[model samples]
Target: SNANVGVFVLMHGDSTASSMLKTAQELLGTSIGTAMNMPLTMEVQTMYEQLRNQVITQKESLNNGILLLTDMGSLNSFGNMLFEETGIRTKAITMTSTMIVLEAIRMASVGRSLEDIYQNIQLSFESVVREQFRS
Candidate 1:
């Protein structure tokens, strides 16, 4: 089922995470990857702060849901802040690698519910890791 709710945005601590997330989005085709082309201009303490300021502030329309994938450094802070601010029913995860991020986007694009996206993300991550390291 396609998310009949809101937008999906993935933010990383740095370009590495951003790039990985972008790859995921592109692979999923839920949305385009042009926005990830540039590095974050501002230096926010947490990805949630950056997300709130970047996408939320500029959000012309309301969204039903949002998925935020971050690294360990800002996981708790970003998640808490997102919950406090937009209250968009966000999902925050740490140690987000390329495979995990991609699967999240893929599931979201496929029209899965937010909860399903989360579950698919974990499953996709495990499957990709196994394939990558398998002999």
Candidate 2:
């Protein structure tokens, strides 16, 4: 069955979160055949209220899957809790790895499971990030 997918960015502050959301959106848009027909939504949370609202509103969208790009913080915990509460499956892309995030979305667009995409990211591009950091 064809499912609706969305990209969710829940971050600590406005600038970095908004910037990464825009960057990911642009990269995904130009990545040839990422079946992201829905507009990329960015939710910047300065406090718990915004984070809660972002999760609630995103859950309301009836999205089959979500790619959550967030830093190492309560965002991950918050996203996990939301999924548990709403029964909507979600993936948290930790460590600010947008390239890995985009690759996952590109794979999902072609009917790949989130788990498979996550595995692929770990296997394929995770090292690239490490290598860059090492350099």
Candidate 3:
């Protein structure tokens, strides 16, 4: 298993991101990585700047790159935006459930590569949506 894949969770609310990590850590041995919360009153640009600096602060575990998971739609391009600005290998998944964060952590801890885990979540979410359409 690789501990080099950085995990970053983004969500709106004062404590949503941190709570997600805490829950994950309680179930798992520890937090897979970091979480950044964007307060409702915060400006997107300000949030972006904060998130960028936050990513910069976590370089060690980013040897394999970072996975950016968000619970909203507006932040979809954040991964590429960060890549453009920081050049760190970045991938993102929007509209994620807290479950997705845990799933990523589980896969990351269970030997799946970063690329594989990103595709895995996207594929799994698509499958669920497709099945829901039939239901």
Candidate 4:
């Protein structure tokens, strides 16, 4: 069987996760990444359990991997801890955007490997920095 991989984005705020995911899905259909939103009022322990459980559930559906996208350093532990426990191969990147998720979804939909899609995005990001802004 082919490797099955998807994005698992965990962003802060009520709709930050869902909104980005919504746009990604809008571009590429509903089979895009999963999202976990951490509201400002939510407790850290609550957020951890929600995201961790979400990750574990998401992991079961994907045998190959799940890329975790977040926007804060505080979110690192979820990805790190999930891998620590479930051993799901992931490309957990902080400070993500809708464009990146869209590209990643399209790449994954086209049967690209999780690692490959992440590299393409990473390379594109690096290339932009290298060519456009670096002096």
State TM-scores per candidate: 0.64, 0.63, 0.86, 0.85
Q: Write candidate 4's Cα lDDT for 6-110 as tens digits.
A: 677778888988888888888777575678888888877887788667766655567777777888877776666767778877677777888777777788777
True-structure RMSD, every candidate: 4.4, 6.2, 2.0, 2.0
| lDDT tens digits, residue span 26-91, model 2 | 866733222211213433233435544555675654356666666655566755765777677877
- Best-to-worst order by TM-score is 3, 4, 1, 2
Q: Highest TM-score among the candidates is held by which one?
A: 3
How many backbone clashes does every candidate have? Answer: 5, 0, 0, 0
Candidate 3 ranges beyond 4 A from true positions: 1-3
lDDT of each: 0.55, 0.57, 0.81, 0.77
lDDT of 2: 0.57
Model 2, backbone clash pairs (residues 3+ apart or across chains), number: 0
Off by over 4 Å in 1: 1-14, 25-30, 33-47, 58-62, 123-135
What is candidate 2's TM-score against the reference? 0.63
With a 3 Å backbone cut-off (N, CA, C), the pairs that clash in candidate 2 are none
Query: Model 1 over residues 1-135: C-alpha lDDT tens digits?
Result: 223323333443346755775676666665532122224553455434545676566443335466666554634466567757766666655666666666666655555676677766767677877998999
Task: Give the lowest summed-lDDT range of ten residues in model 4.
Answer: 51-60
Q: What is the TM-score of candidate 1?
A: 0.64
lDDT of 4 at 72: 85
